Design a binder for this molecule. Structure first.
Ligand SMILES: [N+]
Ligand SMILES: [N+]
Ligand SMILES: [N+]
Ligand SMILES: [N+]
Lengths: 406, 406
């Protein structure tokens, strides 16, 4: 079938408002986690988050941003970055049936959903709600709010799969190109950061709560003292393009997507079975004649999750396990945006030949023994990288990206 | 070039809790719209809805339903029906990497998102929120809550595209089969019915508000006095299966999915451009050399939307316009669940050889002149049918289904 490559990327995360800032943070093992007064004031036990340090005010046209929630804003900014980074101009991607958009969020916008209900319950009712809540709270807000202003004419929808959301978006974009339906598909997602949504995760005890005094140490994937993930927000977008089309326009190709796995655990609702992850990684590795040099694990810094994935990794690679690092230890877990952001971190590592450190590992978990977990920025000529994304509902996504040629 | 067919269906809608009840309602032109005290008490102007007339209490295992919102409950029930209808035993679809599930909702669960925020702000805080809000509120709730209990091992995620949601789910399922990645994919969706979400639509003036005294006459697609859609809830699921696989096990085949269109308007956020719909239908008709005998329009009973779609239909078919009826006049518009429910209504019309009436047209809109809008149940041997689904954000989906031979 058609070969697919990534020709542009854009990102707004807790560790950088663009790929340059993100690159700098990854190289330095810099944490994007900070103390959140908002989370504390809400009554939560987790008082830390990976927030986007960016004043979005005036960055998007008033008539466009009025329909957007933060997830959409983050994705929109990421898309603007990816478009420029891909070297694409309106005449090329706008009003083009061959150019699509597949991007979503894990929870749409709890903030505006609550805003709507709060306003409605007030004395002004519908007048207080306003006519822009649907597009903001809508589960497809991210795709709707981007496809419209960017004049996308091809595929247009969101894929939702919790923590695997943007990973499946990328995989689905790849499929659209392999099916010969699209030449370019902007894929990714965004996730707002708010107590409205964060309290739901805290309520199930999934968030870190023992390190509120030392925010940068809260997310500690593989550390024996980890106690939950640190919620994060942000966006990411990559330009997925058919190989010949990219070469024809002399695009800059970060890597080719040579593998995409999407499986289901069909077991536990909020806990990984590991079995699903094994099949997912194997599916993404099928046909890949090159070994995985680096693996950006899901590793959100959870007691059971972290180890379950490592067990799956050991089962897939055996004694030939690749270098592993969980960027979440630095960035936190951006839920729906995690897939594309982590795919981007992996692409930056592949592009700049280095492995980002898995920080805050003061005491490696006993179940992370015979594995190569990189805890220090290491320069290395990577060729093939893998990124795993596992969300609630036992949904798994794995992407394998490899350098093209020369 | 794998061929894809529908071998089972399940539905929970305002006009029936199974395909038999729905069949009867369709043939009788029975309205599923009722007065809603809940909507009225919330302060809304629209006091009518297409509610699911069923008490789901006890229909789902306690340990399973605890993670579900109404959208998931409706989809789950629909899936049970679809599995039984397809004659699939547990050992035939469970723990099978070749069996997937793609189902979503338009807004996840505004009710539980609001519940979480409300509980969190109360005297109990996190204790009142509970550990089940995430799976209920997340956008992928429908796929997550079904893939897990049904032991799905293949693809598992939700497609979100507002009112086109479940249509894109079906189309994506078709693609998975065409890609040879799955043999069977359960596709569909669900949508809860609540003021929390409904008030958002009312706040933008999208809902009918002039017929609260006569609920069954509120939804009146193509009527000159239509004033907005009537919100509805419910679920639907279809068993999308590779042709050879279905034939091998002697499954009952409703129809082959011979066309699937998915496009984007790249124009207005809450209004259809018509141009996108034209491309969507044309895309779904590629290679389909049989005429469309019946077209189930999106037709939600909105002033602009109703005629915008009719114009697109005229552009696509010209002087060969098919018989048209908007089932939404009877059922109301179930947002994310509309795609699959309407595909199911179309499949029932195809299976039973009749065209459901487009009711409540007391005065046909002047822009509908020269069209074959069916206003009375008509027995007819249909062979190829088309169903359109358009959502906010300019997202379009079209499905074309055709009866297989003998
Ligand atoms: N992650
Ligand atoms: N990852
Ligand atoms: N509809
Ligand atoms: N439809």
């Amino acid at each position: 079938m058609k070969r697919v490559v990534i020709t542009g990327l854009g990102i707004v995360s807790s560790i950088g408002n663009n790929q340059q800032e993100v690159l700098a943070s990854l190289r330095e093992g810099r944490s994007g986690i900070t103390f959140s007064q908002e989370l504390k004031d809400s009554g939560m036990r987790s008082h830390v988050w990976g927030n986007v340090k960016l004043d979005t005010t005036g960055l998007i046209d008033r008539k466009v941003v009025r329909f957007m929630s933060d997830a959409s804003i983050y994705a929109f900014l990421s898309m603007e970055q990816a478009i420029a980074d891909a070297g694409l101009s309106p005449e090329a991607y706008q009003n083009n049936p061959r150019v699509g958009l597949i991007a979503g969020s894990g929870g749409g916008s709890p903030r505006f959903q609550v805003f709507g209900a709060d306003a409605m319950r007030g004395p002004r009712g519908l007048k207080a709600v306003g006519p822009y809540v649907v597009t903001k709270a809508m589960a497809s807000g991210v795709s709707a709010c981007l496809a419209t202003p960017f004049k996308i004419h091809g595929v247009n929808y969101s894929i939702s799969s919790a923590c695997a959301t943007s990973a499946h978006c990328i995989g689905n974009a790849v499929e659209q190109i392999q099916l010969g339906k699209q030449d370019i598909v902007f894929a990714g997602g965004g996730e707002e950061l708010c107590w409205e949504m964060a309290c739901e995760f805290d309520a199930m005890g999934a968030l870190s709560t023992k390190y509120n005094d030392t925010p940068e140490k809260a997310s500690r994937t593989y550390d024996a003292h980890r106690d939950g993930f640190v919620i994060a927000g942000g966006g990411g977008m990559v330009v997925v393009e058919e190989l010949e089309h990219a070469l024809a326009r002399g695009a800059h190709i970060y890597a080719e997507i040579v593998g995409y796995g999407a499986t289901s655990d069909g077991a536990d609702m909020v806990a990984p079975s590991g079995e699903g992850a094994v099949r997912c990684m194997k599916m993404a590795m099928h046909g890949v004649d090159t070994p995985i040099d680096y693996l950006n694990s899901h590793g959100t810094s959870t007691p059971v999750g972290d180890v379950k994935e490592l067990a799956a990794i050991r089962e897939v690679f055996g004694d030939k396990s690749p270098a592993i690092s969980a960027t979440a230890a630095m960035t936190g877990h951006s839920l729906g945006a995690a897939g594309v952001q982590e795919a981007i971190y992996s692409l930056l590592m592949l592009e700049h030949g280095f492995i980002a450190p898995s920080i805050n590992i003061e005491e490696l978990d006993e179940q992370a023994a015979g594995l190569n977990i990189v805890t220090e920025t290491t320069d290395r000529e990577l060729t093939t990288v893998m990124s795993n994304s596992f969300g609630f509902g036992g949904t798994n996504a794995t992407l394998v990206m490899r350098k093209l040629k020369d």
